[PDB]
Design an enzyme around this catalytic site. Structure first.
Site, PDB file in Angstrom:
ATOM      1  N   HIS A  59       0.809  -1.143  -0.146  1.00  0.00           N
ATOM      2  CA  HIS A  59      -0.104  -0.047  -0.019  1.00  0.00           C
ATOM      3  C   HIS A  59       0.933   1.155  -0.023  1.00  0.00           C
ATOM      4  CE1 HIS A  59      -3.328  -2.479   0.702  1.00  0.00           C
ATOM      5  NE2 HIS A  59      -2.861  -2.913   1.927  1.00  0.00           N
TER       6      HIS A  59
ATOM      7  N   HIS B 273       5.343   7.189   6.353  1.00  0.00           N
ATOM      8  CA  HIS B 273       5.355   6.761   4.931  1.00  0.00           C
ATOM      9  C   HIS B 273       4.925   7.480   4.020  1.00  0.00           C
ATOM     10  CE1 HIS B 273       1.210   6.315   6.775  1.00  0.00           C
ATOM     11  NE2 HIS B 273       0.825   6.932   5.589  1.00  0.00           N
TER      12      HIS B 273
ATOM     13  N   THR C 235      -6.813   5.487   4.899  1.00  0.00           N
ATOM     14  CA  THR C 235      -6.815   4.133   4.281  1.00  0.00           C
ATOM     15  C   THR C 235      -7.798   3.279   5.396  1.00  0.00           C
ATOM     16  OG1 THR C 235      -4.971   3.384   5.955  1.00  0.00           O
ATOM     17  CG2 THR C 235      -4.164   4.124   3.627  1.00  0.00           C
TER      18      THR C 235
ATOM     19  N   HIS D 124       3.726  11.074   5.557  1.00  0.00           N
ATOM     20  CA  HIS D 124       2.900  10.931   6.692  1.00  0.00           C
ATOM     21  C   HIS D 124       3.636  10.433   7.548  1.00  0.00           C
ATOM     22  CE1 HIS D 124      -1.138  10.908   4.108  1.00  0.00           C
ATOM     23  NE2 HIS D 124      -0.587  12.110   4.523  1.00  0.00           N
TER      24      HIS D 124
ATOM     25  N   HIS E 298       2.919   8.790   0.166  1.00  0.00           N
ATOM     26  CA  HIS E 298       1.841   8.790  -1.001  1.00  0.00           C
ATOM     27  C   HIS E 298       2.299   9.502  -2.150  1.00  0.00           C
ATOM     28  CE1 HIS E 298      -1.104   7.222   1.878  1.00  0.00           C
ATOM     29  NE2 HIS E 298      -0.670   7.490   2.657  1.00  0.00           N
TER      30      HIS E 298
END
Ligand SMILES: [Zn+2]
Ligand SMILES: [Zn+2]
Lengths: 223, 223
Positions: A63, A89, A175, A108, A91
């Site tokens: 993800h 992480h 998420t 994030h 995006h």
């Protein structure tokens, strides 16, 4: 858990229907990310960051590419409250938008206080020169689902800008299960990355991993 | 310990980010070396040296060529207190500067008092005639990481000028962990070395090993 993603039948627009546990993804009224357009100017408390060189592991969970902190010691203090950094992480492209602008990438930094209350510190990246501070992570980035232990110490303080002014709003996880009650602090100063770095991330993950923006509803964004 | 150097990603600018124990390298306000420009004229106490021919070993630790003293007996007395010489090493080019001037080489005589308080006596070298007093050390100098026993006794008194006038300031170690609370005495009288002696040192160590000068901040240099 129940399988979900960013493409196909299990896309964001379908998250709330693929499991009873993900119902808030479709019914929640305080969802993230958001498009920050109008703001209320206010006197926000200064955040104190205490990150340090630490032993971390880098994982590709299908993800995102996530950097985990098994040990404590990295904290963020705001308004007298201390939050411990659990992981950070990315995006690609960004999830949150500023005046309708989508950025090449967004990081994030997920924190938890003593009472399990979540706080996300967000950093937006503009397209520009290579990010040398991310090179360590990018070099060992698992190209397939898996976890690798970064052998050299990593200092997340190098990923934060000098000025820590931010936008503040209440929201949720971006998420599934889209849990609410999450504090969001989006730094107004941007960092940078090049196209190659962003492309490599999408390669490892397998697709763009940004959730579409959600309506603010009753919420106001403080600046 | 965590790897650090003078070139690449482990250069002086990144020391504070390599490990939490090196944090003072980047956050310290009383760091060494410095560029001595302005000074306050004062009545400084005389330095008394009592060095003697001793059994020492020469070592190449990858950071410098160091001469170690396994036993005490070599002392420096200043203002009633006595410090014992633990070792002396070199930097090419010099770390400290006098009015923006960098010297071909600089020697650091590291001392410790009864309570383990550090004191560094520094000697600056101008380019000139070959230094015959350093031949004994230079000839046995390990060209790779290692330690060699000096067969003949070495008297460090031969490395000190006749006139012991000095510049005095408080500082730190110029290498990680950059510990502060170090007293610095930089001799005003310079010694000499040949270009060949300096280049042989650099060849043995692997690179130039001088830390960039640091801001004096609240400190005053006395002479
Ligand atoms: Zn995220
Ligand atoms: Zn030194």
């Amino acid at each position: 858990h129940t399988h979900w993603g960013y493409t196909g039948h299990d896309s964001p627009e379908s998250w709330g229907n693929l499991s009873e546990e993900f119902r808030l993804c479709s019914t929640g009224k305080n969802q993230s990310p958001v498009n920050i357009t109008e703001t209320v100017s206010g006197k926000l408390p200064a955040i104190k960051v205490n990150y340090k060189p630490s032993m971390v592991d880098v994982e590709n969970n299908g993800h995102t590419i996530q950097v985990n902190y098994p040990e404590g010691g990295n904290t963020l203090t705001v308004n007298g409250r201390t939050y411990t950094l659990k992981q950070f992480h990315f995006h690609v492209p960004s999830e949150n938008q500023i005046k309708g602008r989508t950025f090449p990438m967004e990081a994030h930094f997920v924190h938890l206080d003593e009472n399990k209350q979540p706080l996300v510190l967000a950093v937006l990246y503009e397209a520009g020169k290579t990010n040398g501070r991310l090179s360590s992570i990018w070099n060992v980035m698992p190209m397939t689902a898996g976890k690798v232990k970064l052998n050299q110490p990593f200092d997340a303080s190098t990923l934060l800008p000098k000025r820590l002014k931010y936008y503040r709003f209440a929201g949720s996880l971006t998420t599934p299960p889209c849990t609410e009650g999450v504090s969001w602090l989006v730094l107004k100063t941007y960092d940078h990355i090049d196209q190659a770095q962003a492309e490599k991330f999408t390669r490892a993950v397998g697709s763009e991993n940004n959730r579409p923006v959600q309506p603010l509803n009753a919420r106001v964004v403080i600046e």
